[PDB]
Write a protein that binds this ligand. Structure first.
Ligand SMILES: [Ca+2]
Ligand SMILES: [Ca+2]
Ligand SMILES: [Ca+2]
Ligand SMILES: [Zn+2]
Ligand SMILES: [Zn+2]
Length: 162
């Protein structure tokens, strides 16, 4: 596993998230479900806990965007970059943006929202890319399981569950 330079990590255990907008590709409940599941992946193996906001600034602001979207890193159309997320910290830090030029799906027929959200939330929590090909944090459904490498890395930052 890898962390970010200077090892930025959240200094508190309870983090908020907010789903700022919704893709046309999926029912809203499928977006909410995929996000909740993605957060749970990491909650299960650390002392981190999460709660959702519907107004104000949550630590992890989640949104869908296309091309230029209010930051220095425009998305690139279909394929290639699927989403991006910022390392822990204030403001834009922690936030996760999903390219709506992808076709987000609940299954594997398009780009699976849950898998990509789980990987991006890893970044939001302070893990950079792993060298292990089976890790969620490697740049790349019934068989999904967080790898030990991912657990080792997230626990290196936040410890194991109490
Ligand atoms: Ca933030
Ligand atoms: Ca793209
Ligand atoms: Ca789309
Ligand atoms: Zn962005
Ligand atoms: Zn990544």
């Amino acid at each position: 596993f890898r962390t970010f330079p200077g090892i930025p990590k959240w200094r508190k255990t309870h983090l908020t998230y907010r789903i700022v907008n919704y893709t046309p590709d999926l029912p809203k409940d499928a977006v909410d479900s995929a996000v909740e599941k993605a957060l749970k992946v990491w909650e299960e193996v650390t002392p981190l806990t999460f709660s959702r906001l519907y107004e104000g600034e949550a630590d992890i602001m989640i949104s869908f965007a296309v091309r230029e979207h209010g930051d220095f890193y425009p998305f690139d159309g279909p394929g290639n970059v699927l989403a991006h997320a910022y390392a822990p910290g204030p403001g834009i830090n922690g936030d996760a943006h999903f390219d709506d030029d992808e076709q987000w799906t609940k299954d594997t027929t398009g780009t699976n929202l849950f898998l990509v959200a789980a990987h991006e939330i890893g970044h939001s929590l302070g893990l950079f890319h792993s060298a292990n090909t089976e890790a969620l944090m490697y740049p790349l459904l019934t068989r999904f399981r967080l790898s030990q490498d991912d657990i080792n890395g997230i626990q290196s930052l936040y410890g194991p569950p109490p």
